[PDB]
Amino acid sequence: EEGKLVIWINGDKGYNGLAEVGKKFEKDTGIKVTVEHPDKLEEKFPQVAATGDGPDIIFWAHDRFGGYAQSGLLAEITPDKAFQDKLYPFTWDAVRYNGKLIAYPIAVEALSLIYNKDLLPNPPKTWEEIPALDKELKAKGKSALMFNLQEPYFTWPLIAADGGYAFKYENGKYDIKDVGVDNAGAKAGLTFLVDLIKNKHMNADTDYSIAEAAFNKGETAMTINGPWAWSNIDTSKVNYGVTVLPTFKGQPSKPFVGVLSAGINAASPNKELAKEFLENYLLTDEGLEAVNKDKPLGAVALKSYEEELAKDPRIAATMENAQKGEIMPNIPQMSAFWYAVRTAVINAASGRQTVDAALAAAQTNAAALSHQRLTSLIHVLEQDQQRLITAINQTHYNLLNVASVVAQNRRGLDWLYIRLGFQSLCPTINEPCCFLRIQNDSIIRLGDLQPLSQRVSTD
Amino acid sequence: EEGKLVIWINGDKGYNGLAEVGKKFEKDTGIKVTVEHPDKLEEKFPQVAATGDGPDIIFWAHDRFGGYAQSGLLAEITPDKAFQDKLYPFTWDAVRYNGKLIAYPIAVEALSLIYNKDLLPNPPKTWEEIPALDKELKAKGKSALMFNLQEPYFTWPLIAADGGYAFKYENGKYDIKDVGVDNAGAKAGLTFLVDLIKNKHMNADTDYSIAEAAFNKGETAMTINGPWAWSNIDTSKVNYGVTVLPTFKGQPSKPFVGVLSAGINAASPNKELAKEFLENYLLTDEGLEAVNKDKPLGAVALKSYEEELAKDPRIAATMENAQKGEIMPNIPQMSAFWYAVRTAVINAASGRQTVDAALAAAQTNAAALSHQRLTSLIHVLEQDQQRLITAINQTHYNLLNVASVVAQNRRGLDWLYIRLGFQSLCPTINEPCCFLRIQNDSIIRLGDLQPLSQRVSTD
Amino acid sequence: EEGKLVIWINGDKGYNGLAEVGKKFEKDTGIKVTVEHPDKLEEKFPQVAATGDGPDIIFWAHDRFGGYAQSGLLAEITPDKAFQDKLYPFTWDAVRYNGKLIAYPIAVEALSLIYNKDLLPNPPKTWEEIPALDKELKAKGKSALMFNLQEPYFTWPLIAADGGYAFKYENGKYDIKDVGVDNAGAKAGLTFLVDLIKNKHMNADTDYSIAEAAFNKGETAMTINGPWAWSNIDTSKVNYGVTVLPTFKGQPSKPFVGVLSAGINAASPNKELAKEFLENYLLTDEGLEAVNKDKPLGAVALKSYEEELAKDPRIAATMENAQKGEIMPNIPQMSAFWYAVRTAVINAASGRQTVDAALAAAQTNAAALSHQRLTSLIHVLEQDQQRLITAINQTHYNLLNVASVVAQNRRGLDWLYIRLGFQSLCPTINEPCCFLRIQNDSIIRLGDLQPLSQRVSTD
Ligand SMILES: OC[C@H]1O[C@H](O[C@H]2[C@H](O)[C@@H](O)[C@@H](O)O[C@@H]2CO)[C@H](O)[C@@H](O)[C@@H]1O
Ligand SMILES: OC[C@H]1O[C@H](O[C@H]2[C@H](O)[C@@H](O)[C@@H](O)O[C@@H]2CO)[C@H](O)[C@@H](O)[C@@H]1O
Ligand SMILES: OC[C@H]1O[C@H](O[C@H]2[C@H](O)[C@@H](O)[C@@H](O)O[C@@H]2CO)[C@H](O)[C@@H](O)[C@@H]1O
Ligand SMILES: [Cl-]
């Protein structure tokens, strides 16, 4: 592991293009670079890193990096002044935590409205016109809009539009106790979304893959997604545009803006190699181009290459949406916020909770990293109890099966004894009879249990 | 469910009288009203309401409504100025939360001392005289005092008398971090109560039903209860009075005063029908009278009807005790407070904990809604582990039973083989013998486990 | 239990000498005194005391007593002015909590460097010289240093040296939210220690017993321990000295100073007997001498006897280290702090976590008594799940064993039926055949579960 590099990046990004940068590094230096894209990497990273494992370099939007740093998992990076000047200062702000740089910023990501120019020459300026737009499109076997409803990143622009917010920003400092997921703006936003589902303009089950396939197959007029998605739309040959997100109550949708960033694992014995790879290889016009040609990065942090990329109307639209949204905080509590909003949106979308109760609970859960932890614990314990009860049940049925064969064996022993002219088995061998007797009251008592979450609230 | 009303109210209130109001509503409008009184309604409500179920209207004392509102579960009510003027302003204060009305107030409830005039013509002015009073009554086969020891509502007046308090009220705002369940006043109060149990003037097991039956049967000279209880005493024909609660250390007992209130479920598609039922039907002299004749409501919020009720010496006594106690907060943390005091009082009463350790723990638990949650979780997990271990144990014994029949079957197979002049089973069929071999070290290791609560504290 | 005394004291202290004081008490008064030294007494005490059990008198360093008092478990002690003057005021400060005395102080304990004068005539002034010292000692079949790595008390002096601290002390008041276990000083301290283990100058598994035996057997040049340990070194006949702890980065090591103290259980019906035992018997030159001759107490609180003890160069060294360290807080949060640092040090020492991730987690856990509680809960639940799964697994294998005998019984039934000229069992008795059929998918699904802690973090 010393003398080589392992890099993790998300499965929706240009990892094959990044591997080409790794191949050039290897060509020039002899150093092997391996790029992986595990699932749930943003959750896997802190677990493996804490034990001194995990990759040398970790790529994610900047919002998770404050927590990683607070947890002891990141090396402070040491770019000199000349390198720092190569990148936009606002990108350096995104990766600064308690005064220290904790990652290299790569690219600015914001969500936009992506629309099919052949189905919809002139896309809606407002969210409110969508149901009527969907009505007409449905008559022709299409739909107006499909996007990932399973990740709150995609719904947040709408929730934020009328006033919803994560943590209040005042005096240059986020207040972790002031959360705006349950104010009037947020409620209106999510109610409008759940209204779309109620009136069957969207489906609660739609996830990344489903929306992408529908848009890329010409089935839906619009989707909501980031620069990474453009590559596959090009391949699909759909005639698409990338524009400003619809307004809600006359207010701009407010995407949470992410800076794709690369951190160095505090436990890496390859911190200098990682620095040189990121600074001398990836963060160059040629390194970034290789990644971008694979899956587009968005508006890159590197001024020299961004000056070219900026002339792309897709990148102009990206930055227009960015300017309307807000840069994500990188505070450790961002993971509690996302977990809470994720739970709210899914619960509300699927009709398992009301909008207002979903959001009230999110408000509580976002307002403490320990709050979600308790929520997560009870959720996981509830699952474990069901797995335990299931195993206990199956063993019971297994035992009943075995008993059935034992009973047949006993009947066969008796029949034969009698047929050969003895008494039945037990008086013949002169033993008190052993009878099958199975108690099941315990098993029945387990099958009665309401789920753990309910029983904890009802105590 | 649209076009009809479902109402929940507690099993100790006039629900048959409320159903008569529902019947009149149905007569005038065609709208069916169904009144239910499930057990634990105050705990069932928030669970079903959060999923968009539960009743249209929920009745409880006002203290729980802040939490329900904070959780997204209540509609703001919209009574006009003319209706608002019909009710006392202090009752409207009880149902106001973060500036909004969240329920209709119905009636003011306070606990009083109810005494048997034939056993006790002149009831005690002080708690301290009770043991000597009980001494003499016991000589004649009676007791001085019996009341519900399972619900802290009933013991709180005593605990509060010498200085105990829930949340500190200053600057018109409750301090959730300043809790007075473990100060000197509170300790003295609960010690005096546990002293009554120690010296056998009361029993820790006495609950609502036991006290009510004893008083109503003429077995005990005194009880502590609310206006709802009077109805059944009338039926019993006991000659009773309703008076000021005894003093403790020369201080008035301080009942936590409740306003029976009716909220509208945020998820009800019948919010206007509910408004009209509460405003045009229940909150009238005739609506309230129908409920009151069933079980007395106390001092009603409706000025017109209260002006009659006030002439009742029982209602005068009720309000004298109310004025000496304090209006309950309606803050979300009230449920943590009640849970904590409930646990303390029962633990101390039953001698499972010392007064001082019981109250110290209550202090901690009341000082955070998340604190009780952890306490409740561990309590529930401890129960679940025991249920799991019990099932695991019974399956083990089931398996031993099955094995016993299998062993007898094997002995019978061998005997017969030999009797028919073969060798035993296994050399005859030419197989290595399979032997019953049951491992039980796991089962024994489970039977060794101290309860979860102890093991978590001892980690 | 009324009319006798039960005393708990730790197994490393002079409990046989304390029992001699108990015997003198019994001789003079008739009152039986029983001294016990259960394991984990500091954790057992609060559990048994809360139920009104446990000893009359509890001995521990003063740091745990604030929590015991806050939990309702200690009697305020009532020494008069004349008795108070017998002991140093700073010892009385150690046992004062929210303005009240909650224990009798006995003796001041600080860790020192204990060295073998024959292996090491001139012990190191610095931690940094130890690896080179160990290098040379190892060549002669010895080692430089061995001390208990399982209890953070012993490692803290080093962690504190360069700036690590527990709770920030300002304005005479500890800030429970300002914890210094994860600052630069603390990280450097623990990194140096783990570096010693990496480079094999110490072993992560070394505990109290192992270090004591190695030093007392002449195998290692140095150990770190308190006055109690001297007694067994005397017995060993090793030629030892007791000196100032090594410096780290030119800074003194900073032992957390403990005052061995004796509290009276709030639930004791023997509070006056306990007072008289502690004041009239133990806290005398003769009482303390009896304990000290068993295992040395350190610098005693009793001025009269300390004036003699102070002339001991071992006691001078003890107090030099004390003055360089700091008196422990007695705040309730000390137990969360010790639990957190214990976990960090072991995790880092054993290489299960990195120094930086270990300490970051400790920082979080020390910063709330409820934080550790959640950590402890998940740790205990993880263990319980494994015990449950193990039992579920063994029952499965038990059932497979039983099934194997049942299958052999069936084969023997068939063979015999056929041999006696019938058909096989089932067509002969004219029954559909029952077959053994065991489902195991549940069991396999349980064997797949990652540990609970990981799954809760990954939710
Ligand atoms: O859905 C919550 C999720 O949102 C963001 O993740 C984005 C990411 O920033 C983009 O690069 C892209 O991969 O889509 C992701 C959503 O699936 C946050 O960065 C992440 O922390 C958060 O969990
Ligand atoms: O015991 C705690 C309990 O007290 C109060 O409940 C009262 C209620 O207000 C009365 O209407 C009557 O029904 O007796 C109840 C006690 O059993 C609080 O209102 C309730 O929130 C709390 O849990
Ligand atoms: O290791 C943490 C532990 O440290 C202290 O315990 C000391 C004790 O003070 C000494 O008398 C001696 O017995 O060694 C102990 C360490 O094993 C704290 O007093 C204790 O609260 C803490 O858990
Ligand atoms: Cl069998």
Author numbering:
A (entry chain A), B (entry chain A), C (entry chain A): 29 to 487
Sentences from the paper on this structure:
Here we show the structure of the post-fusion conformation of the BLV TM ectodomain and demonstrate that coordinated ions and a network of hydrogen-bonded water molecules make critical contributions to the assembly and stability of the trimer-of-hairpins form of the BLV TM and are essential for TM-mediated fusion. As anticipated, the overall fold of the BLV TM ectodomain is that of a trimer-of-hairpins, with the N-terminal α-helices twisting around each other to produce the central triple-stranded coiled coil that is characteristic of class I fusion proteins. Buried leucine and isoleucine residues within the coiled coil predominantly mediate the interactions between monomers, but strikingly there are two polar layers within the coiled coil that establish interactions with ordered water molecules and a chloride ion respectively (see below). The predicted disulphide between Cys384 and Cys391 is reduced in the resolved structure but this does not appear to affect the overall protein fold. After Cys391, the LHR begins with an extended non-helical leash followed by an eight-residue α-helix. This helix is followed by a three-residue linker incorporating a single proline, allowing a sharp kink in the LHR prior to the start of a second α-helix that adopts an orientation almost 90° to the first helical segment of the LHR. In this position, Thr353 participates in a complex network of hydrogen bonding via several buried ordered water molecules. Based on the chemical environment, the shape of the density and B factor comparisons we have modeled this feature as a chloride ion. This chloride ion is situated towards the chain reversal end of the coiled coil between a group of three asparagines, one from each monomer of TM (Asn367). Intriguingly, Arg413 projects back along the axis of the coiled coil and binds between Leu407 and Leu410, where it forms hydrogen bonds with Gln343 from the same N-helix and Asp342 from an adjacent N-helix and also donates a hydrogen bond, through the ε-nitrogen, to the main chain carbonyl of Glu408 of the LHR. The most notable difference between the HTLV-1 and BLV TM structures is the resolution of a second helical motif within the LHR of the trimer-of-hairpins.
